[PDB]
Amino acid sequence: SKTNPRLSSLIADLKSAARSSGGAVWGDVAERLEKPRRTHAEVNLGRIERYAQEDETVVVPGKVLGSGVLQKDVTVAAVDFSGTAETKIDQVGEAVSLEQAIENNPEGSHVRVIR
């Protein structure tokens, strides 16, 4: 099914973290990533700006894109970011990989899922 070996590794790591540190978000994200690419999140910034609050990490089971404006200072964790998205986010906040999210927060506390 999946041909990207890094996507598979990501998914395997998300499961290991959910089964141990009890973060149910990571399991939820793993299952969505296992679903067809078609269903994966593609989120622009306007959507993150609208639903995010500070000191709550935004989690995108998918990829973050660059339309819209992000003022809020937030940590956004995603499978990938467009070049523009990562640049706009790093100005007011922090763009981070899901692999880092799992490291800093294996229990998946204080996160909000956004698609």
Partner RNA sequence: ACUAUGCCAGCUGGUGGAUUGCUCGGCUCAGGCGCUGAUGAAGGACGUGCCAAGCUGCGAUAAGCUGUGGGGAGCCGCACGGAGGCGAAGAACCACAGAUUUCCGAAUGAGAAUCUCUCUAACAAUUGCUUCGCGCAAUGAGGAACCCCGAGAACUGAAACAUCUCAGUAUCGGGAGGAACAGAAAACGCAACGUGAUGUCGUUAGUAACCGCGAGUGAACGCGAUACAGCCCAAACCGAAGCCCUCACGGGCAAUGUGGUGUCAGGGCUACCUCUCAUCAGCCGACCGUCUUCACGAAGUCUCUUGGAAUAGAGCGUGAUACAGGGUGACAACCCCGUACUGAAGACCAGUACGCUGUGCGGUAGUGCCAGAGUAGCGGGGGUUGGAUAUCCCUCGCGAAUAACGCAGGCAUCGACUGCGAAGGCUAAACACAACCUGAGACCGAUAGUGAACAAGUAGUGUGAACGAACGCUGCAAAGUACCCUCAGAAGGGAGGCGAAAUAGAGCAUGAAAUCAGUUGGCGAUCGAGCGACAGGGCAUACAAGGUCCCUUGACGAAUGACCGAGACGCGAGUCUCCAGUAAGACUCACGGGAAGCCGAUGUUCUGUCGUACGUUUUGAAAAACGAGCCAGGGAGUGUGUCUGUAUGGCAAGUCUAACCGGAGUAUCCGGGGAGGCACAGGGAAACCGACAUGGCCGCAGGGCUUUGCCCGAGGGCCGCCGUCUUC
Partner RNA sequence: GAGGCGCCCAAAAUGAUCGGGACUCAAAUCCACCACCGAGACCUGUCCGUACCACUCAUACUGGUAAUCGAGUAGAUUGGCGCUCUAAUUGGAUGGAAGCAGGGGCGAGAGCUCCUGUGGACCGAUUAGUGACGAAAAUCCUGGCCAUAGUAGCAGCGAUAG
Partner RNA sequence: AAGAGUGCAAGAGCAAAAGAUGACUUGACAGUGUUCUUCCCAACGAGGAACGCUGACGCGAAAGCGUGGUCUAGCGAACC
Cβ at position 69, least distance to another protein in Å: 6
Footprint (CB under 7 A) of RNA, residues 43-102? 44, 46-47, 49-51, 53, 56, 63, 65-69, 80, 82-85
Cβ at position 12, least distance to Cl ion in Å: 26
According to DSSP, the residues that pair with 76 across neighbouring strands are 58, 95
DSSP 40-72: SEEE-HHHHHHH--TTSEEEEEEEE---S---S
Cβ at position 15, least distance to another protein in Å: 26
Of all helices (H) and strands (E), which one includes residue 76?
strand 75-81
Instruction: Give yes or no for residue 27 binding another protein (CB under 8 A).
Output: no
Interaction mask 12-31, RNA, x per CB under 7 A: x--xx--xx--xxx--x---
Q: What is the DSSP letter of 15?
A: H
State which of residues 13, 21, 68, 94 lies at the interface with another protein (CB under 8 A).
68
How many residues in total does the chain contain?
Answer: 115
